[PDB]
Amino acid sequence: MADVEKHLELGKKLLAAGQLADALSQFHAAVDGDPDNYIAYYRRATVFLAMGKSKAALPDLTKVIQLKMDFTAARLQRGHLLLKQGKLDEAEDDFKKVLKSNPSENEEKEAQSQLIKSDEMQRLRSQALNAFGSGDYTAAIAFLDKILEVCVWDAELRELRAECFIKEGEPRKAISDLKAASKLKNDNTEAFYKISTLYYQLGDHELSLSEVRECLKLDQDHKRCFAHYKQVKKLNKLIESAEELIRDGRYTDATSKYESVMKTEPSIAEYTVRSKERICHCFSKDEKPVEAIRVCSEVLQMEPDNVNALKDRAEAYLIEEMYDEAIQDYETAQEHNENDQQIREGLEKAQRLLKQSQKRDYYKILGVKRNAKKQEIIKAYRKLALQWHPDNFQNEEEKKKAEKKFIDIAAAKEVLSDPEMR
DSSP, X not given: OHHHHHHXXXXXXXXXXXXXXXXXXXXXXXXXXXXXXXXXXXXXXXXXXXXXXXXXXXXXHHHHHHHOTTOHHHHHHHHHHHHHTTOHHHHHHHHHHHHTSXXXXXXXXXXXXXXXXXXXXXXXXXXXXXXXXXXXXXXXXXXXXXXXXHOTTOHHHHHHHHHXXXXXXXXXXXXXXXXXXXXXXXXXXXXXXXXXHHHHHTTOHHHHHHHHHHHHHHOTTOHHHHHHHHHHHHHHHHHHHHHHHXXXXXXXXXXXXXXXXXXXXXXXXXXXXXXXXXXXXXXXXXXXXXXXXXXXXXXXXXXXXXXXXXXXXHHHHHHTTXXXXXXXXXXXXXXXXXXOHHHHHHHHHHHHHHHHHHSOOSGGGSOSSTTOOTTHHHHHHHHHXXXXXXGGOOSHXXXXXXXXXXXXXXXXXXXXXXXXXX
């Protein structure tokens, strides 16, 4: 009908304008209106492909083919797709029938180049699995890395490689594949669960949560997903809230939410380690030096390179006027993060005070200002020197201590006469 014509035409304009989502809407309308119009099926597949929707394109393309078996450009299209999906054998059968069908000169060049690739894919697949079967994981990765340049939408193999990075002790390198695999399979809940937990495991709670919400959108009654859901949702509030508080500068509150974070997930180290960094942060930003040093130091026993923990402990040491240990920290921090304005401003501001503290102040032996007025000093000296005379002290060890204060008071008067003021 005219409708199916309008759907296709608006479909066309939209696609051309890059408007994939609504183009798809319209071809959907076009397919429903005339369920036997190969053009509708073809134009939809064309969008699906444009959108990365690998699974959805295939049944539409083979429909186009079922209806119009002479239409070889759709057979070549389905050829390409299946080769992306890593359904090699079938990708070969189409690429070959394309060649047996008076192809275009550009259709011959494609159908051929592809079979050439496909041949290597079959060898690389077999090497990949074989490597994997014997436990040669780094071997398997190298093969698979190559297959997946070409088979970019082989979910199964992506999964295998993720499993490789994992056995290798490199879990984070498996986020891409596992995320990809769930995207392609589209309505497989297990794929969302796997990616949701791998995220959780890495302390990626925000994603993990959103990613399991997907599982449950697919299956409301999925037991395992829901269990995990309760879990990360709980741990998400606690962490989100913890940080809300840290920005309000409610540090002891923040610290309490973090103790809850750790109590809610004890098994995974990252949730314990990262909580401690944040607690270390709370204490330091709260001017609680001994507590900062105690917690921050423990964080560094676990992660000696923790730039954030070093900055917070540095800050603690500054409070304690521990200028050496502050620089040592700001420095060992500067090693791991090369140019940080905060680190550098810390190292200079620590050094300035390390210098100024070694610089003896005769006024610091009593003077009201860097300029105590007139005979205020003479009043201070006579009393102090008379107070602090080793004669005063019967205790031998106590005396020797007065003496240093006496030499100090005396050396003060000596330098506070006439020109020696500067």
